[PDB]
Design a protein around this nucleic acid. Structure first.
Ligand code: ZN
Lengths: 207, 112, 122, 56, 123
RNA sequence: GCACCUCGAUGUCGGCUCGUCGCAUCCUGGGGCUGUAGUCGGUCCCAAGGGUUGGGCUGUUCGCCCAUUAAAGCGGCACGCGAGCUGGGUUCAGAACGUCGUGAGACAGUUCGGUCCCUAUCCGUCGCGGGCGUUGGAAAUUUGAGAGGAGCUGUCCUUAGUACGAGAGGACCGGGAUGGACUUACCGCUGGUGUACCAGUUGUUCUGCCAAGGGCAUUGCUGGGUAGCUAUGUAGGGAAGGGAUAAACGCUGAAAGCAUCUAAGUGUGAAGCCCACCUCAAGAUGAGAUUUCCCAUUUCUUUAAGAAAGUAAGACCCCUGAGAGAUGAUCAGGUAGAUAGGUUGGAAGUGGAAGGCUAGUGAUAGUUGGAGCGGACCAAUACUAAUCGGUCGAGGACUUAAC
RNA sequence: UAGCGAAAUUCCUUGUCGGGUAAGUUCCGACCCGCACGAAAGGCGUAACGAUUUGGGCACUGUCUCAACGAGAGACUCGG
RNA sequence: CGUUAAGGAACUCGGCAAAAUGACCCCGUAACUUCGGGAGAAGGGGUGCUGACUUCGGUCAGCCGCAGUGAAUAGGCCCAA
RNA sequence: GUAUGAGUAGCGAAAGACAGGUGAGAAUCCUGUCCACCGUAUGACUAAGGUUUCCUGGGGAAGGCUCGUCCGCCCAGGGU
RNA sequence: UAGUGAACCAGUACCGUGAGGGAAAGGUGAAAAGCACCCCGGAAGGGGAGUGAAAUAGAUCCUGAAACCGUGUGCCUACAA
């Protein structure tokens, strides 16, 4: 239901009111413009478009500025949706500010990972080595392709092929502060993402 | 750096004295057995600093009953009452890791 | 980070000095152990007299690792040896004296007859 | 290993559809109309930015 | 950075190239060497501005110790030694300029290797 | 056992890496009986979802032994896998012992040492691009036909010293706390690396000399170390539920005036099946859906779904680049500019620069001063470099019904 | 005969007892039912010597638990 | 080719390969024996710069660094068969 | 004689950079400067062996594992 | 590719210390009348103009097949084992 996108800044520490150290990430936000309302009568499901930043006017198109123009804002970059929300309560062109997650405290964080190029068959899957001495020649290889009888190779025998670039949720994290005047949520733990990327933040599914 | 130093100015302690690595220091740390709160004491030698702002740290070495004991601390805890600079030292290094292999009448530091 | 075929020391008056580990009890393939864990172990070197002699299957508990534990404050303890104290599975030592400082994290594990014998409980 | 068979006449000309050469970025000058590469000093003109650079 | 060679050979190269542009003020080389020479020449002329130091006693690393650049006589054959030219000519030319003392142009590929080439000037 | 099969040449069993399948089930899950008081057990039925340890002695298939664990399953895949590895042992040429042979020599008797080649063409598998189609031309947001992942479990407290027992001992069903193994993501902490960062120091050489500095000696060696990448570090994960079932247990009820879970009708019922959790997904040629943008010259070929040409919306070529990267792609920008380099400030990080003064006969010490130096990190600034330009790109077929 | 003896020789065999190890069919010490040791195709001891074969300790360590980072050449892109 | 936390033969047929010792001066040195040896047995200590004293040889005082044959070259040892 | 493999593997241990020359044409030839390597040898003198490779002036069809105005290569003259 | 191994400067070139072994390679037209002169190009090479009955007989020179490599086009091909 509750949902705010945003950026990724870095890592900090916070003493809580009992005095314990806690590792803390930093997520920003902005004003938060609702773009369309999708109904069953026209689209067969129910959702809400949402998008967070301000492009310059040089960097968009006449279709984008026609699509934004029923909310009277600048053209915005990161347009996404949100499902599973009971609507009411949502006009075209509102602002879903940082106020929503004051005591939410259980949150799914869905970033997108880094990227690491081609890498070996170990670093994807943790397959162990072979021996580095006693005469061998089998230091860092991906194993054997299977048995002999089927005259082929089965599928999902994992080999080399680029690390990272796919999107990963993490379930059931806590919220520490909500700083409305500076547009910052603080989260315990670790968010998948490079800096300046997107991060979606939702109220968690598993209660 | 810009928002981080904004968001963490409430919790930076300001009343911490100035000490260089190589200075003997007491630590009036707090010991929490749940309800009870008593105050232990170190008297060691300061070896580390790690400049980071919010989360700098430092180490202290006793020599208690023949066995060396080393304990780090972050600076900005509410669970440290005071820090008492006691002595000073002629030291030309920044991190004094060479003290582990020494004993007694050889791990001495000079005084200023 | 103490494993199989790793040599501790004895901090008792129980006639043993240096011990090899055998296993890392509790679990089904646990690799390492930290302060407050239980070892099956056997005495290598010994002293004349004393109760415990060489070649005995002997349980012990780690005091003073060289990579001690995080506390929830934020401090870390790091000693300069390894040590063990031979235990009757009553959680009660065999000797009547313990040498050297002893880290506090035995109190979570209820070795309350050992901690009241240490010179300094750190 | 070792090739199993002769590859036919067709698979040559089905591999070699990506063994092409291409020219990129030919523009007219501002001073002679001669097709010379963009973001590059015009060789016969000597006239980058409308300024003669190759000067002694 | 840009790796080109082993470690000490890059230091040899970037001392060799950047004492030209101090004697000749024009160089024809490739792309990558030109961008490293951007960085190093603009780091050395700002030692050219001070005149202490320490301006002398830091410029005695990235400048070849003596390479004469003599077009001068009063009644002698007096010598400008490729560092004295920094602390006499190139220093006070840029008393009002901030950073950015170099231009790079894009001429032709070389005949033998098709390596694309570059002229570096100052102004 | 037989000799169809491979002699113009198909390597032996263990071990390493990597798995996969069957169920005659080793643990966990659900049941029936008991010569089942309780705690334990014995046997049989359903059930393949996950898991199944480190060592010591043998070349070892076998095995025996130590210590653990919920448990340390049985088999197939050329007794799995040498164009992936080991070459250990058995099966080359040397030599020796026991036994046999008159003798050259021999022994599934034994002991030491012994040359294992291959630059992937096709299918296969893992990743990534080009073209076309998707029936006017484009920019974005999605539904899910299908498919993959994940599926484990211990210990303690309380109900309770209760039920059961003469005692000895000692629960089912519930609630809570906390670990092992595995696994997703990240660098604030603990640590590692960090060869264009800082300092010390030996030899010799060079910048004329003293002072100050470069070159070479594995980066000369030694002590620290930023970003980036990292685990043994940090945080999280398997929760809770729904529907139809298996073995088993019934309710009602006759065939067969009783009985009886079954033929008519109606239920309970497992880590298993289908959902629920995460990911991919319209080349799903059955090519889906919504929002927004753009509206007409010449030739007649004979007007047909004709050709040819300049455009609109928009994309590309080229250039500065990294949060991306084998190349191509992706993403940030291109003077309506902070895209990179420099400049001015800082920060991490070394630990007190050069010059000069004082104290010392000297090596050296103090002070001018937390000084000097400062790769990737943080802000401000158009000074230098992305100017000039060019290429591609629609005018919207037919039938029928409803209006 | 002396002298040795589960041996470079022993099928049964991992003979039996002692030592060494948490655990030792390999090693060392002893016994004798030597399948089938034995006196110049020499028997039994032996200091020094051995790029000889076998068993065990100290010190040291990426061989290992379990991997991580950096440098150079090849691999990749463009020209011959 | 260079470096590594904690552990230090758990790898393996086998410590194969790497790591560790290595220069000069001084103290000290076993069983056994063919009396020559073993023996560099094992195990330890010192090294830089300045001043004075000194016949010779070194001593005494002082100074600095984590480390003073500061780089390169230069034996791992013991117990049994 | 010509294909396929395929415009793939390889291009046979080592440090170069710039300015000015000549020329139809230059990273590869000439000259200048700085840097770097060996230095019980990559320095000097001779015995075998080779048999004109020596010097001067021209040339770029083939050889040189690329290019080449250059060469121990081709042409002409000449030296013990 | 026959006929001597050798129709051509063949027991030669080349291979082995040596005894020995041992190749491939014929054809312009009748007559060299073998392309003066002009243009591109450093040259090679080519296009005109000529000699010639013929130059698609231009010196690798009568005729000139096949594999192999190219250019242009009438028909077909992007849900197919
Ligand atoms: Zn022009």
């Amino acid at each position: 239901t509750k949902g705010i996108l945003g950026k990724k800044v870095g890592m900090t520490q916070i003493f809580t009111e009992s005095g314990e150290l806690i590792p803390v990430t930093v997520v920003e936000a902005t004003p938060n413009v609702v773009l369309q309302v999708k109904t069953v009568e026209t689209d067969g499901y129910e959702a809400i478009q949402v998008g967070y930043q301000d492009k310059r006017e040089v960097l968009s198109n006449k279709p984008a500025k026609g699509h934004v123009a029923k909310a009277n804002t600048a053209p915005k970059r990161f347009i996404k949706e949100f499902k599973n929300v009971e609507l009411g309560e949502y006009e075209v062109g509102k602002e879903i500010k940082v106020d929503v997650f004051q005591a939410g405290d259980v949150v799914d964080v869905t970033g997108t990972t880094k990227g690491k190029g081609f890498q070996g068959a170990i670093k994807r899957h943790g397959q162990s080595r072979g021996p580095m001495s006693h005469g061998s020649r089998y230091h860092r290889r991906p194993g054997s392709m299977g048995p002999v009888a089927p005259n082929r190779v089965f599928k999902n025998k994992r080999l080399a092929g680029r690390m990272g670039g796919d999107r990963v949720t993490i379930q059931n994290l806590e919220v520490v502060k909500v700083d409305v005047e500076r547009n910052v949520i603080l989260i315990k733990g670790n968010i998948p993402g490079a800096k300046k990327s997107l991060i979606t933040i939702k109220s968690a599914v598993k209660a | 750096n810009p928002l981080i130093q904004e968001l963490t100015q409430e919790q930076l302690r300001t009343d911490i004295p100035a000490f260089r690595p190589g200075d003997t220091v007491r630590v009036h740390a707090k010991v929490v057995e749940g309800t009870r709160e008593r105050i232990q004491l170190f008297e060691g030698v300061v070896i580390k600093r790690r400049g980071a702002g919010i989360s700098e740290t430092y180490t202290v070495r006793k020599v208690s009953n023949g066995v060396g004991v080393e304990r780090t601390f972050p600076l900005h805890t509410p669970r440290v009452a005071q820090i008492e600079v006691v002595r000073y030292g002629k030291v030309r290094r920044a991190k004094l890791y060479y003290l582990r292999a020494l004993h007694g009448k050889a791990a001495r530091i000079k005084e200023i | 980070m103490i494993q199989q075929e790793s040599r501790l020391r004895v901090a008792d008056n129980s006639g043993a000095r240096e011990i090899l580990t055998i296993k890392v009890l509790g679990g089904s393939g646990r690799k390492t152990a930290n302060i407050g864990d239980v070892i099956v172990a056997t005495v290598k070197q010994a002293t004349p007299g004393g109760v415990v002699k060489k070649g005995e299957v002997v349980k012990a508990v780690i005091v003073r690792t060289k990579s001690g534990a995080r506390r929830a404050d934020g401090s870390y303890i790091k000693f300069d040896e390894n040590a063990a104290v031979i235990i009757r599975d009553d959680k009660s030592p065999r000797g009547t004296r313990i040498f050297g400082p002893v880290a506090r994290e035995l109190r979570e594990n209820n070795f309350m007859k050992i901690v009241s014998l240490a010179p300094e409980v750190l | 290993a070792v090739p199993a068979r002769r590859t036919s006449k067709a698979k040559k000309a089905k591999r070699r559809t990506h063994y092409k050469l291409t020219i990129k970025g030919l523009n007219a000058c501002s001073n002679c109309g001669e097709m010379k590469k963009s973001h590059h000093v015009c060789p016969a003109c000597g006239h980058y930015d409308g300024k003669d650079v190759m000067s002694k | 950075r840009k790796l080109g060679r082993t470690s000490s050979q890059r230091k040899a190269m970037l001392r060799d190239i950047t004492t030209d542009l101090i004697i000749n003020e024009r160089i024809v080389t490739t792309e990558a060497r030109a961008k490293e020479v951007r960085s190093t020449v603009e780091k050395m002329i700002t030692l050219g501005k001070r005149g202490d130091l320490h301006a002398r006693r830091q410029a005695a690393t990235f400048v070849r110790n003596e390479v004469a650049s003599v077009r001068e006589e009063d009644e002698s054959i007096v010598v400008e030694s490729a560092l004295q030219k920094l602390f006499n000519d190139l220093g006070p030319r840029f008393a009002e300029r901030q950073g950015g003392y170099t231009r790079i142009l894009k001429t032709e590929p070389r005949r033998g290797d098709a390596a694309p080439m570059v002229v570096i000037e100052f102004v």
